[PDB]
Amino acid sequence: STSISSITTNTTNLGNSTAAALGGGATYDPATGAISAPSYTTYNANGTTATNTSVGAAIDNINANGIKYFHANSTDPDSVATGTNSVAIGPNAVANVDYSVAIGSGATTSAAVPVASASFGGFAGSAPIGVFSVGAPGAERQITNVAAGRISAASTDAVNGSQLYATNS
Amino acid sequence: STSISSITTNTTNLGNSTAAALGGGATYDPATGAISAPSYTTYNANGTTATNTSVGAAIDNINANGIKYFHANSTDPDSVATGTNSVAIGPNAVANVDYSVAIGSGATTSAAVPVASASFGGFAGSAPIGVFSVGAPGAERQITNVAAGRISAASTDAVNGSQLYATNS
Amino acid sequence: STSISSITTNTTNLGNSTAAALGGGATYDPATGAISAPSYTTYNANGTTATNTSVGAAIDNINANGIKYFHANSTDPDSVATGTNSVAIGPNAVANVDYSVAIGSGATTSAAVPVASASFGGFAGSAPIGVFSVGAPGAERQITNVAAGRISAASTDAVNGSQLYATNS
């Protein structure tokens, strides 16, 4: 009888502590032995959320659809970042150059080309650490909503089309 | 007595295998039935980490604060990526155009406009796949730390302010 | 005997419901008490996946190696986003300016400088909300695969090197 009591009491501790470790509102019922399903929220890419009733479902959703504030809408192959300290974001993005970024579907990286002058000298940012790629040859992206950059010898700001327009008027 | 022995032995296997499945240093104590709490590390956006004692707490932290190397500091609405193979990063970012990126708080996407010439011809990157947006109309971002781009007919590198400065001196 | 029956039946419910909550194909065996290990897939940064046999291992892999479509290949310090609604991506990236982005290894942010004219006026995007940084002083990135931007007074598109080349020929 003492053994039966011990097992019952300890099994309740097992149920309770399992539910506690799961979180997501899981609870243990000593009358039935059931742990009620956890509810884990994940963030879809379309402005909605999903309720997951297992840990595995939540992990799969994190990979399939992203996390809050970081979403790629795709079923294409994973991005690949093999460069040292490199970042690859989006389906089929490949950052194989060191200290670089590939961002956007199909974006690739090739080595940075240092530019100090052109045939005009004294360029700022003449010694790049790597590239920041927004696409690939033949699959370029138009970079939009760029604020006017400083136009000075020291400036490493990007310039926008309105600035090139003004200088050619 | 054999039944009591069987239950005890099997319940220890249940406790052990639950702790193993949880990981995070969770352990089972057959004397009490308790699974000790796991410790799961998540990465905050301020250079610190958090210790989570449930799976649900860790999942919530991943969404609220990001993962190592990918942080958005916000409580505003999720980004939304509805374009095919599109990427949306940051609070209120919306990438609804296909093969595009919206990155930054409030960034939006509109269709790319192909540009082969302007009133000057022979532009490289005249057939964009989509846009890479760093903001929205009236909420543009200054793009900074841009290395000097190649200045040649083939170049799809961005140019910086020092380069526009040099050509107008 | 009824108590032994009750415990056995309830413990099976505990095992089953634990396996259900774990997901990842975990199953309970009433003959042994064992929950078979879950298998949780995470995405490495080199085009491969990993099979994790605990929740903690999966969480650690998500942080160490990223999620599908979002990978930074590094063991350097976390990115830091302390600016309001700011985004920091990549090892050692720091977005401390509000409404800004730092993306790329070692990228930093400093305050946007509004530019409406230069010594040329009527620039579009003269009131930036913040910065979009692809690097840091002395560690700039060459921005690549930029489609030709609109060249007009209204344009906030980035311009590429071929466009600057054409205007100086």
Q: How far is it, in rounded angstroms, from Cα A32 to Cα C72? A: 46
Nearest to C164 by CA among B107, A75, B146: B146
Neighbours of A3 (CB within 10 A): 13
Instruction: Kindly report the nearest CA distance between residue C88 and chain B, in angstroms.
Output: 5
Q: Give the helix, strand, coil percentages of chain A, each rounded to 5.
A: 25, 20, 55
CB count in 10 Å sphere of residue C40: 28
- Candidates A86, B75, A98, A112; CA nearest to C92 is A86
Surface-to-core class of residue B48, CB atoms within 10 Å of its CB (0-12 exposed, 13-18 middle, 19+ buried): exposed
With left for phi above 0 and alpha for psi between -120 and 50, is residue B61 left, alpha or beta? alpha
Residue type, position C127, single letter: A
Interhelix angle C55-65/B2-22, nearest 10 degrees = 10
**What resolution in angstroms does the PDB record give?**
1.4
- What's the start-to-end Cα distance of chain A, in Å? 97
Tokens standing for residue C25: 């194909």
* Phi, psi angles (nearest 5°) of residue C161: -60, -30
Would you call A136 helix, strand, or coil by DSSP?
strand
Closest Cβ–Cβ partner in C66, C99, C128 for B67: C66
DSSP designation for A49: E
- Taking chain C, what is the end-to-end CA distance rounded to the nearest angstrom? 97
Q: Is B164 in contact with A167 (Cβ distance < 8 A)?
A: yes
Closest by Cβ to A115, choosing from B37, B150, B156: B150
Using the beta-carbon criterion (under 8 Å), do A141 and C145 form an inter-chain contact?
yes
List the beta bridge partners of residue C72.
A87
Host domain of residue A42? 1-169
DSSP string, C83-97: STT-EEESTT-EE-S
What method was applied to determine this entry?
X-ray
Task: Tell me if A118 and B163 make a contact (CB, 8 A cut-off).
Answer: yes
Record: contact A158-B148, CB cut-off 8 A: no
**Residue C102 and residue B106: Cα distance in Å, rounded?**
15
Indicate the residue type of A77: P
Q: Which chains touch B (3 or more CB pairs under 8 A)?
A: A, C
Which residue type is seen at B121?
G
Question: How many domains does the structure of chain A reveal?
Answer: 1
Q: What element of type H or E holds A70?
A: strand A70-72
Residues of C in contact with A85 (CB under 8 A): 72-74, 76, 90-91, 105-106
CATH code where residue B117 lies: 2.150.10.10
Nearest neighbour of B131 by CB, restricted to A66, A76, A142: A142
Q: Is-contact A130 C139, C-beta < 8 A?
A: no
Scanning every residue of chain B, which has its alpha carbon at the shortest distance from the alpha carbon of A92? B85
CB of A22 closer than 8 Å to CB of C21: yes
Q: In terms of CA atoms, which chain B residue is nearest residue A132?
A: B146
**C14: phi then psi, degrees, rounded to nearest 5:** -65, -50
